Structure 1
């Protein structure tokens, strides 16, 4: 099929997505940047999709429709769930764009996450299927993991949704391009790793450092001490890096950084289709841009040593990494306008 600007797709119904791509790249994402709107859009993929619970369905209760646009269509309900603090900003930015292009909310949310992540250095190229229906119901509350939930709780929730522990760790590669706004609002924009525009393994390294700093005036629910000026640390990430159920796979992204993109891609393709049958969607994956940037070598931050790493994988020692020279410079907050 002939799409706009001389582009083609095997299925004519993919053509619309090239026009959505141009709009979000130029406007929402300020010229194809891996910044604030990308980070928010990637988080939104999870907050929409994870509202899916076979455990509830099996007890004769509504379990949620998964990657169905519900968080957007029913934003008034879902964005007031506690675990959805901070999501309404991006939902309200995205909603009129989906409507103006007459594409479904569920499809738009996943598309924005896939396009956006491809803008990050060394980023993924997530599969993109289209055809999700807008006709759904609001998610039940209490289906989105919180940063104060135990590893047992997070793994049981994610397991109900369909993800093994290794896949939970892979999905958390997203925290390599990520910041917080609502855990400590005064430190809004402080990222989870030193490189929030690079889809790299710094998140996995830096979460294994000993927490030594309270970045603001106090700690807050869901937060623990951070290791580096400018960085923010979630309670949950700290625990998952160190728990025996997840610690080896956490370290695996440091030992074998080349695996991060493929494992994230596979887990995201699954997440993006919770509540859907791919065989009844169309494959518009070719619309997603090809990411740029090499696989970076993970390093220890300037001023840190191996003694600062709380190595937690029983079977295998923490890999030998280079250490950045000199003294550490505080990590810049992520810009937002």
Structure 2
């Protein structure tokens, strides 16, 4: 079918998404950037989708509708859950856009995550399906993993929702394009790796370095020491990198960087459809732009060595990586406004 700007699609109902695409690239993402709004949007995909618990359903309680737009439709309720701190911002930015184009909140949330991540260097091209209903109920509280939860707790929660340990590590490739605002607000915008606009393996490398510094005035609930100035480290990411249930897969994105995009794409297609039936939605994947950028060689930061890595996968030694020349430069906070 014929869509705007001479573009075409197999299914006429995908056409509206080219217009949403044009809007959000130009306005929300400031010209196709992989910056704050994209990072916020990719996070919102998980905070909407993970409110899905077959464990609650089996006990005769409402378990949440999954990727259903509930965080947006019932924002007054969900954004005030403890685990949802920091999301009010992007929710309040996205809402009027989805209303304006008259697309469902659940569809919009996954679409902005998929469009946005495609802007990141070396980024993924996430499957995009359309047709989720705006009729749902608010997620139960206590379904979103928090950075001070144990690995056992996180793996049990993710597993209830349908993810294997290897899938959780893959989904955490998102932290390669990510920063925090709410754990230490004085360091709002400090990223989880040295390259928050590149979808690369530096996150998996740098979370394996020994933590040596407190970046702000003190540590805070959910934070641990950082290995590099300007970086921020989450308690959960540190533990997941070293725990025998997840440590080999973590390191596998360093040993085989090419595998990060496909494993992330497959896990996100599943996440994006929690509480949905794909055979009852429509496939609008061709609207998602093709990402640009080569798979980058992972490297050790300037001034670090292999001795600084806490290798944690017993079956397989940490790969030999190049080290950046010279002295390290403090990582910039992610910009903007």
Q: Secondary structure at the match of 2:27?
A: helix
**Secondary structure of 1:194's partner?**
coil
Shift of 1:268: 0.1
**What CA distance in whole angstroms lies between the structure 2 residues aligned with 1:163 and 1:32?**
31
Please state how far the C-alpha of 1:191 moved relative to its aligned partner: 0.1
- 1:140-172 CA-partner distances (Å, limit 9, x unpaired): 000000000000000000000000000000000
In 2, distance between residues paired with 1:57 and 1:302?
50
Partners of 1:289 and 1:246 lie apart in 2 by 32
**Equivalent position of 1:13 in the other structure:** 13
Cα displacement string for residues 91-118 of structure 1 (whole angstroms, at most 9, x for unaligned residues): 0000000000000000000000000000
- TM superposition shift of 1:37: 0.1
Runs of 5+ unmatched residues, structure 1: none
Tell me, in whole angstroms, the C-alpha distance in 2 between the residues paired with 1:295 and 1:313: 23
CA deviations on 1:4-39 (whole Å, 9 max, x unpaired) are 000000000000000000000000000000000000
Secondary structure at the residue paired with 2:304? coil
- 1:297 equivalent in structure 2: 297
Structure 2 counterpart SS, 1:190? coil
What secondary structure is seen at the aligned counterpart in 1 of 2:332?
coil
Tell me the distance in 1 between the aligned counterparts of 2:280 and 2:333: 42
Distance 1:5 1:86 in 2: 36
Q: Structure 1-normalised TM-score?
A: 1.00
SS at match of 1:154: helix
Q: Structure 1, residues 292-335: CA drift from partner, whole Å, max 9, x if none?
A: 00000000000000000000001000000000000000000000
Q: Residue 95 of structure 2 aligns with which residue?
A: 95
- Whole-angstrom CA distance in 2 between matches of 1:12 and 1:315: 51
Unpaired stretches in structure 2, ≥5 consecutive residues: none
Q: For residues 134 and 303 of structure 1, what CA distance do their matches in structure 2 show?
A: 51
How far 1:56 moved relative to its partner? Answer: 0.1
Give distance in 1, aligned partners of 2:122 and 2:92.
29
SS of 1:191's equivalent? Answer: coil
Two-structure CA RMSD over aligned residues (Å): 0.2
> For residue 276 of structure 1, what is the aligned residue in structure 2?
276
Counterpart for residue 77 of structure 2: 77
Q: Distance between the aligned counterparts of 1:51 and 1:129, measured in 2?
A: 19
Aligned match of 1:149: 149
TM-score by length of 2: 1.00
Structure 2 distance, partners of 1:227, 1:53, is: 36
Cα deviation for residue 59 of structure 1 reads 0.2
Deviation at 1:336, TM superposition (A): 1.9
Distance 1:108 1:92 in 2: 13
1:245-279: per-residue Cα shift (whole Å, max 9, x none)? 00000000000000000000000000000000000
3-state SS of the aligned residue for 2:125?
A: coil
**1:45-75: per-residue Cα shift (whole Å, max 9, x none)?**
0000000000000000000000000000000
